[PDB]
Amino acid sequence: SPIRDVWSTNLQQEMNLIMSLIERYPVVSMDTEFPGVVARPLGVFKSSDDYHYQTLRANVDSLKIIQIGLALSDEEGNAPVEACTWQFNFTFNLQDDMYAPESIELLTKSGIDFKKHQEVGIEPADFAELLIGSGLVLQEEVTWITFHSGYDFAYLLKAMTQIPLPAEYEEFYKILCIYFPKNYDIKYIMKSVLNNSKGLQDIADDLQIHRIGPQHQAGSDALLTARIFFEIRSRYFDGSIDSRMLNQLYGL
Ligand SMILES: [Mn+2]
Ligand SMILES: [Zn+2]
């Protein structure tokens, strides 16, 4: 089982496992699945970067996370034999929660069992308490990697701080850099630096990287993100990512 699935019933067991591994496998790749974008901000803003943040803020605050994928690697890009990736499945209620009906349809066709999420879905507050104590955050020794990172980190921040996201991007960025002092945004790298526009899967296809698991599920996407990072690091950066790219978020 290259993919370890996590529900409320084995949350502690799985976080313990990740904790025992993080020192030997200090690169964390993450992806998230949430109920889509439901609405856009109306009015006028300070900028396009500001427009993007307000869009993120409104949506992250209102819509509940459905999955988070975490894939661990060592610095050479090797995964632990224990697991290629973890898939954390969170509590969600189709009768009671806000979502775009289209996103739900896509996730269902993607394999998600919304019944199980309602029954044994993880509470984000429980996950966040363990994540905070895990050694994965607040530690400059750990590298976080994400494709399109505003949404991913925002959902973690939301779970960890248990308060609304900062009104302004500058403060959001400050907090983000506290909990995730060392991070790379693959979207920023691919598009803003290397001028390549393609999406996760497209990029994946060119690099002939084989997907493990279903598309649109966080565990699989997190693994794919890891493999894309290390291949790009190797092909275009000769072994080491440029430090000027650290903590640079795409579109913000
Ligand atoms: Mn993503
Ligand atoms: Zn995803």
Write the CATH number of the domain with boundaries 1-252. Answer: 3.30.420.10
Which residue's structure tokens are 């975490």?
70
Q: Which of 224, 197, 190, 188 is nearest to 209 (CA)?
A: 224
The answer for residues whose C-beta is within 8 angstroms of residue 40's C-beta and 6 or more apart is: 55
* CA–centroid distance, residue 31 to ligand 1 (Å): 5
* CA–centroid distance, residue 218 to ligand 1 (Å): 8
Q: What are phi and psi of 106, to 5 degrees?
A: -60, -45
Q: Which residues belong to the annotated binding site for Mg(2+)?
A: 31, 33, 152, 221
Q: Which ligand is nearest to the CA of 146?
A: 1
In single-letter form, the type of residue at position 245 comes to M
Count the neighbouring beta carbons within 10 Å of the beta carbon of residue 38: 15
Dist CA 223 CA 212 (whole Å) = 8
Residue 184 structure tokens: 């790379």
Q: What are phi and psi of 181, to 5 degrees?
A: -60, -25
DSSP secondary structure string, the chain? --EEEE-TTTHHHHHHHHHHHTTTS-EEEEEEE-S-------S--S-HHHHHHHHHHHHHHHS---EEEEEEE-TTSPPPTT-SEEEEEB---TTTS---HHHHHHHHHTT--HHHHHHHPBPHHHHHHHHHTTTSSS-TTSEEEESSHHHHHHHHHHHHH-SPPPSSHHHHHHHHHHH-SSEEEHHIIIIIIT-----HHHHHHHTTPPP-S-TT-HHHHHHHHHHHHHHHHHHTTTTS--GGGTTPPTT-
138 in the Ramachandran plot: left (φ > 0), alpha (ψ -120 to 50) or beta?
Answer: left
CA atoms within 13 Å, Cβ hemisphere of 9: 6
The answer for residues whose C-beta is within 8 angstroms of residue 43's C-beta and 6 or more apart is: none
